[PDB]
């Protein structure tokens, strides 16, 4: 339960398991930056990538000092 | 690998309501832009 | 801006992997003999001072966003005689690793996918004369940049390439104020069959066949201060797709595109020169250039400036480069930074390329 | 756009209504095996 992105190859949202401190996730997604910038809280971690496109996206989850980055897959 | 269930949205409940909107397109040899919801036609001349 | 650039497969072969060349404005075809000199001009491996050398180079991608994406390179050269040398490099562009899962438990099995792209090449360089050498390189290119899902196949696409290079380095010629040294080099890269990403006969992409011709001069002061000025011209040997058309409306576009795509690479090499309504003056725009100056102190400190320019109408990748190199005992460390000057965002901006080369064996004299 | 052309996400459909809930065109109102008498063969896929 350290930090999870449960559905990585998703045709839907992101569930984003993490600690208590809230999140500042963002998406750039293949080229340059196309910030989504939602405001995920501790107990409502649901994203929205279902509509944008299909590709290998970059996310930068920010739990204060816990800046964990990674790649998600829009299917 | 999933069993074939009469439950499409995976909420464990089998719906039985029939309240929906119906749209339709015609499939005819001579479909042209401007009608039948046709908004664009791309003709490809020679494909290898 | 850019109008109809050439569509070639595996473009990562054209990215400078070593920090020395990336600090010299992405050109090394005519610079001094170097360990990293496999991507640019293998023919100078015959002129290497040390018996053998290894090199590890790192070029981060999108440093601000992700720390996984990168282009690494491992090069190893070994000269047996004073007339020949064997070299082998391995360039690997990788996205790191995507740990795809579909459940919430922190212990369920996750599937790792690492879409990557690597070229493994090996070259033999023979010193024909005392000042001139040739080299032949065989390269295997594999691309696995796709992620396997339903109704999509992620089979890796492979191809082979042949590089022919030549390097001429004159003896130390004295002048009125300094004893300089002349160098010249040419390199034809990535001559091979089309790489097919779809594994189908019809849809194939050309290899980035390249032609580099460069020349350089060394000013030598006190025998321990060097100033090398190098100038390289580069050209792509792949036919350019037609623009508006050379005859409804989509018919001409499709016909011209089909005519362009039904061209073999062997014929494409000859068809590269021209194939445009413009004249020779307009045709000459296809050549990119790069000018660099490298200052060496005590053969153990190096400060390099470079300027790389492409055409406004294609590529549009113009920048300046700073580089610094230090040799402690046998390890040379090189750092390179890039200042962009083009209207398009260069993915190498704000990126400090790194290189680390070990040199070992007997010391061979240089003519 | 929300992509709807994934093959595995479609499943066999119920018998539809055409004009209204009172239109028994495809026998969608029947409570016997006649509910399926107008179903012809349909294959949906993505060529591998």
Spatial separation of the C-alpha atoms in residues C301 and C257, rounded to whole Å: 52
Q: CA angle, A21 as apex, A20 and A23 as ends, to 5°?
A: 115
Residue C303: partners with Cβ closer than 8 Å, 6 or more residues away:
C294, C295, C323, C324
C335 φ, ψ (degrees, to nearest 5) = -125, 135
Q: CA angle, A14 as apex, A9 and A20 as ends, to 5°?
A: 135
Around Cβ C9, how many Cβ atoms within 10 Å?
Answer: 21
The residue assigned the tokens 């009125």 is C176
Spatial separation of the C-alpha atoms in residues C172 and C20, rounded to whole Å: 23
- In 3D space, the residue among C77, C70, C76 whose CA is nearest the CA of residue C95 turns out to be C70
Spatial separation of the C-alpha atoms in residues C185 and C133, rounded to whole Å: 10
Tell me the three state secondary structure of residue C254.
helix
Q: In chain B, how many H helices and how many E strands?
A: 0, 0
Q: Where are the beta strands (DSSP E) in B1-48?
A: none
What does R_g of chain A's alpha carbons equal in angstroms?
11
- In 3D space, the residue among C355, C218, C346 whose CA is nearest the CA of residue C292 turns out to be C218
Which residue in C62, C103, C147 is closest to A73 by CB distance? C147
Tell me the three state secondary structure of residue C265.
helix
In eight-state DSSP terms, residue C251 is H
Pull the structure tokens for residue C233: 């011209």
Tell me the three state secondary structure of residue C71.
strand
Query: Is C150 close to D48, i.e. CB distance below 8 A?
Result: no
Which residue in B44, B45, B48 is closest to C202 by CB distance? B48
Around Cβ C307, how many Cβ atoms within 10 Å?
Answer: 19
Q: How many CA atoms lie within 13 A of D40 on its CB side?
A: 1
In chain B, which among 1-48 make CB contacts under 8 A with chain D?
4, 8, 18, 22
Q: Where are the beta strands (DSSP E) in chain C?
A: 50-60, 70-78, 84-94, 98-100, 111-113, 116-126, 132-144, 157-169, 173-174, 179-191, 210-221, 225-236, 288-297, 301-309, 319-327, 331-340, 353-363
Cβ contacts below 8 Å, chain B against chain C, sum to: 16
Pull the structure tokens for residue C58: 């790192």
Find which of A71, A73, A74, A75 to mutate to test the C interface (most C CBs within 10 Å of its CB).
A71
The residue assigned the tokens 């580099």 is C212
Residue B12, exposed/middle/buried by CB under 10 A (0-12, 13-18, 19+)? exposed
Query: In chain B, which residues have their Cβ closer than 8 Å to the Cβ of C258?
Result: 46, 48
- In 3D space, the residue among C135, C231, C144 whose CA is nearest the CA of residue C182 turns out to be C231
Pull the structure tokens for residue B21: 């909107």
Burial pattern A8-43, b for ≥16 Cβ within 10 A else e, equals: bbbeeebebebeeebbebbbbbeeeeeeeebebeee
Around Cβ C214, how many Cβ atoms within 10 Å?
Answer: 26
B6 φ, ψ (degrees, to nearest 5) = -85, 55
Q: Categorise residue B29: left if φ over 0, alpha if ψ from -120 to 50, beta otherwise.
A: alpha
Q: CA angle, C70 as apex, C68 and C71 as ends, to 5°?
A: 155
Tell me the three state secondary structure of residue B5.
coil
Cα distance from B8 to chain D (closest Cα, Å)? Answer: 8
Pull the structure tokens for residue C216: 């350089």
In eight-state DSSP terms, residue C205 is B
Query: Is D21 close to B18, i.e. CB distance below 8 A?
Result: yes
Q: Are C205 and C9 in contact (CB under 8 A)?
A: yes
Q: CA angle, C132 as apex, C293 and C183 as ends, to 5°?
A: 15
Residue C130: partners with Cβ closer than 8 Å, 6 or more residues away:
C171, C367
Residue C116, exposed/middle/buried by CB under 10 A (0-12, 13-18, 19+)? middle
Pull the structure tokens for residue D46: 């993505």
Q: Cα–chain-centroid distance for residue C26?
A: 7
Pull the structure tokens for residue C116: 């990557």
Query: Is B18 close to D18, i.e. CB distance below 8 A?
Result: no
Tell me the three state secondary structure of residue C150.
coil
Q: Categorise residue C245: left if φ over 0, alpha if ψ from -120 to 50, beta otherwise.
A: left
Q: Are C331 and C339 in contact (CB under 8 A)?
A: no
Query: In chain D, which residues have their Cβ closer than 8 Å to the Cβ of A54?
Result: 3
Pull the structure tokens for residue C349: 């901006």
Length of chain D: 48
What secondary structure does DSSP assign to C84-125, as a single string? EEEEEEEEEEE---EEE--S--TTSPPEEE--EEEEEEEEEE
Spatial separation of the C-alpha atoms in residues C335 and C323, rounded to whole Å: 6
The residues with which C125 forms a beta bridge, in sequence order, are C85, C135
The residues with which C87 forms a beta bridge, in sequence order, are C77, C123
Spatial separation of the C-alpha atoms in residues C162 and C141, rounded to whole Å: 11
Q: Cα–chain-centroid distance for residue C277?
A: 30
Burial pattern D5-39, b for ≥16 Cβ within 10 A else e, equals: eeeeeeeeeebebeeeeeeeebebeeeeeeeeeee
Spatial separation of the C-alpha atoms in residues C276 and C290, rounded to whole Å: 25
Find which of D9, D14, D19, D22 to mutate to test the B interface (most B CBs within 10 Å of its CB).
D14
The residue assigned the tokens 């901006």 is C349
Residue C36: partners with Cβ closer than 8 Å, 6 or more residues away:
C17, C18, C20, C21, C28, C55, C57, C73, C75, C355, C357
Pull the structure tokens for residue C257: 């595109």
Tell me the three state secondary structure of residue C156.
coil
Please give the helix or strand (H or E) that residue C253 lies within, else none.
Answer: helix C250-261
The residue assigned the tokens 């992101």 is A14
Residue C358: partners with Cβ closer than 8 Å, 6 or more residues away:
C53, C54, C55, C330, C331
Spatial separation of the C-alpha atoms in residues C152 and C231, rounded to whole Å: 45
Which method, experimentally, gave rise to this model? cryo-EM
Pull the structure tokens for residue C365: 């004299």
**CA torsion through residues C221, C226, C229, C232, sign:** positive
């Amino acid at each position: 339960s350290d930090f999870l992105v449960y559905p990585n190859p998703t045709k839907s949202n992101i569930s984003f398991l993490f600690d208590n401190e809230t999140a500042s996730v963002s998406i750039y997604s293949l080229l340059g930056q196309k910030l989504i910038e939602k405001q995920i809280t501790n107990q409502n971690p649901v994203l929205s990538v279902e509509g944008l496109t299909n590709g290998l996206y970059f996310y930068t989850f920010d739990a204060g000092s816990l800046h964990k980055t990674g790649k998600i897959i829009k299917q | 690998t999933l069993p074939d269930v009469e439950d499409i949205n995976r909420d464990n409940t089998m719906s039985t309501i029939n309240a929906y909107y119906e749209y339709s397109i015609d499939v005819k040899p001579g479909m042209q832009v401007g009608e039948n919801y046709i908004t664009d036609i791309r003709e490809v001349t020679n494909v290898d | 801006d850019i109008e109809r650039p050439i569509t070639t497969g595996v473009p990562f072969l054209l990215v400078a992997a070593d920090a020395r060349a990336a600090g010299l404005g992405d050109q090394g075809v005519a610079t001094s003999s170097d360990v990293f000199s496999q991507q640019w001009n293998p023919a100078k491996y015959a002129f290497a001072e040390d018996a053998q050398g290894l090199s590890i180079s790192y070029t981060p991608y999108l440093t601000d966003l992700a720390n996984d994406i990168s282009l690494g390179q491992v090069t190893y050269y070994n000269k047996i005689n004073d007339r020949s040398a064997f070299a082998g490099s391995f360039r690997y562009f990788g996205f790191g690793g995507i740990e795809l899962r579909q459940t919430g438990d922190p212990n369920e099995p996750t599937r790792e996918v690492n879409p990557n792209e690597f070229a493994l090449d090996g070259s033999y360089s023979l010193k024909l004369s005392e000042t001139f050498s040739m080299a032949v390189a065989a390269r295997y290119i594999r691309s696995n940049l796709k992620v396997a899902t339903e109704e999509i196949d992620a089979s890796a696409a492979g191809s082979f390439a042949v590089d022919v290079a030549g390097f001429y380095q004159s003896e130390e010629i004295a002048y009125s104020d300094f004893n300089g040294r002349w160098r010249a080099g040419f390199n034809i890269q990535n001559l091979g069959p089309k790489i097919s990403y779809d594994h189908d006969d019809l849809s194939a992409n050309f290899l980035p066949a390249n032609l580099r011709v460069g020349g350089g001069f060394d000013f030598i002061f006190d025998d321990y201060n060097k100033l090398g000025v190098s100038l390289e011209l580069t050209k792509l040997l792949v036919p350019t797709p037609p623009g508006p058309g050379t005859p409804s409306q989509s018919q001409a576009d499709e016909a011209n595109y089909k005519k362009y795509k039904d061209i073999g690479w062997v014929s494409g090499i000859f068809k590269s020169f021209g194939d445009a309504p413009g004249g020779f003056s307009e045709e000459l725009k296809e050549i990119t250039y790069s000018a660099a100056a490298e200052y060496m102190y005590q053969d153990a400190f190096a400060m390099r400036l470079g300027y790389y320019h492409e055409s406004p109408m294609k590529g549009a990748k113009q920048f300046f480069s700073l580089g610094a190199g230090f040799k402690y005992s046998m390890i040379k460390v090189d750092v390179s930074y890039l200042f962009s000057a083009s209207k398009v965002k260069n993915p190498l901006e704000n990126t400090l390329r790194f290189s680390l080369t070990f040199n070992f064996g007997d010391k061979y004299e240089t003519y | 756009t929300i992509d709807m052309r994934s093959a595995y996400a479609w499943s066999l459909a119920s018998t539809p209504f055409i004009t209204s809930i009172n239109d028994n065109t495809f026998n969608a109102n029947s409570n016997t095996l006649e509910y399926g008498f107008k179903r012809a063969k349909l294959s949906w896929y993505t060529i591998d």
